[PDB]
DNA sequence: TTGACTCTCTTAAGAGAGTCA
DNA sequence: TTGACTCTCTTAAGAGAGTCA
């Protein structure tokens, strides 16, 4: 809600509930042929999910609290960042899952950045493979690699140059 | 159904028309602090665009040919790949602009790959900065870099471990 | 046969808000 | 107040199809 005290209360309440979510260990590529371990705090697959949480889509949830008899609701991954600017360079700030695990709500696996930065982490080589993100990646992106291109650049005639 | 000859004729007509688009020289980052040159053949900003071309959206165009009284239409960037498979690994193949210049229709600047591979090139370090794309990038992606993250992973209490 | 417009849809990273009990 | 559902929207890389003359 409006007051700093109320916001801190929201963050602390959210952390307590998510702190009780099942902790699941995931072993992950770091880049450079190295492997690491992440501990994700995963929201349940079906109701009940936890105090204040409800599912609004297959892998979308919201956190709800009643303050001053008014209902305040936020995207379930956004709560750690309620005290942060909600935009940057004219772009909306988004909750960005460093572990690439949508059910995870571990705030140590989340950052707050533009949707472009967020998406781009899917192709990052990872913290031991050359990641240059200022807020460093926790793992190599799931989509990093040579790709599966069907056809490359080509022309039939002689009208074009690179 | 259009024959291979008819399809080849469509590709030849497209190349002949696009080859007359204005050719614009762009200096671009290659990665590794190096600079290169790309020559883009750019569709005009407003009508007329060229024989067979029409704008269906702000930066979307289609190419149309009528053959034996039947109207055929294709996405304007897809024509170089009409003789290629149209899906791979169960994913639709898409025209992927290696020059990251949407108005460009230079077929030497296009490849044919899944939408995920396509998008991921936005963050590639480039052909001289460590690109691992099997069909190599022509330049460093416009979104490669440290990013502009507003807040990193953090907790208020002690409920979480990484 | 052709040009110049119109509209809506896909994907996978993200969101807001309403209806009931 | 709290829980468990419903619906649609945003972005930036990509698409298909209709109307009229
Ligand atoms: Na993400
Ligand atoms: Na692209
Ligand atoms: Zn996680
Ligand atoms: Zn990274
Ligand atoms: Zn180009
Ligand atoms: Zn590349």
């Amino acid at each position: 809600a409006l007051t700093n005290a109320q916001i801190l209360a929201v963050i602390d309440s959210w952390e307590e509930t998510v702190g009780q979510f099942p902790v699941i260990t995931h072993h992950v590529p770091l880049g450079g042929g190295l492997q690491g371990t992440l501990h994700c705090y995963e929201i349940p697959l079906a109701a009940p999910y936890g105090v204040g949480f409800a599912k609004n889509g297959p892998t979308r949830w919201q956190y709800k609290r009643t303050i001053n008899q008014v209902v305040h609701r936020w995207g379930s991954h956004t709560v750690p960042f309620l005290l942060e600017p909600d935009n940057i360079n004219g772009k909306t700030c988004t909750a960005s899952a460093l572990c690439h695990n949508t059910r995870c709500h571990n705030p140590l696996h989340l950052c707050w950045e533009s949707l472009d930065d967020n998406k781009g982490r899917n192709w990052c080589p990872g913290p031991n493979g050359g990641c240059v993100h200022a807020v460093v990646c926790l793992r190599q992106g799931p989509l990093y690699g040579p790709g599966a291109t069907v056809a490359g650049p080509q022309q039939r005639g002689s009208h074009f140059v690179v």
Side-chain angles (χ1 to χ4, degrees), chain A:
Chain A
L2 309 170
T3 79
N4 177 271
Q6 282 160 330
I7 288 158
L8 288 203
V10 176
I11 302 176
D12 291 334
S13 67
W14 181 95
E15 283 190 5
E16 182 123 285
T17 305
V18 169
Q20 291 323 291
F21 287 176
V23 187
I24 290 116
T25 297
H26 294 292
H27 303 278
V28 297
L30 305 176
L34 299 176
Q35 168 162 307
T37 302
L38 303 183
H39 301 95
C40 293
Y41 290 63
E42 300 191 344
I43 199 157
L45 276 186
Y49 308 93
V51 173
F53 287 97
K55 172 185 288 165
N56 56 317
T59 71
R60 300 300 299 167
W61 309 267
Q62 293 167 296
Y63 187 62
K64 164 168 86 186
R65 297 279 77 185
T66 296
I67 341 276
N68 309 129
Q69 299 201 251
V70 183
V71 163
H72 296 253
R73 196 159 38 164
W74 317 259
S76 63
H77 293 108
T78 69
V79 175
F81 308 110
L82 285 185
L83 279 187
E84 292 302 322
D86 59 32
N87 78 107
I88 181 44
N89 283 344
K91 295 143 198 293
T92 308
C93 284
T94 67
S96 175
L98 296 175
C99 59
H100 301 282
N101 179 8
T102 309
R103 282 173 60 203
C104 180
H105 287 71
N106 188 344
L108 303 182
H109 293 183
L110 296 172
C111 67
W112 192 240
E113 60 191 359
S114 73
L115 188 62
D116 269 344
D117 281 354
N118 186 329
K119 289 158 148 172
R121 294 187 189 265
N122 296 348
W123 295 272
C124 185
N128 296 79
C131 165
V132 295
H133 286 101
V135 172
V136 70
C137 284
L138 291 182
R139 52 161 291 163
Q140 176 178 93
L143 303 183
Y144 166 89
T149 305
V150 166
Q154 58 194 88
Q155 71 181 317
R156 305 227 325 129
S158 299
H159 294 305
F160 303 100
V161 299
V162 186

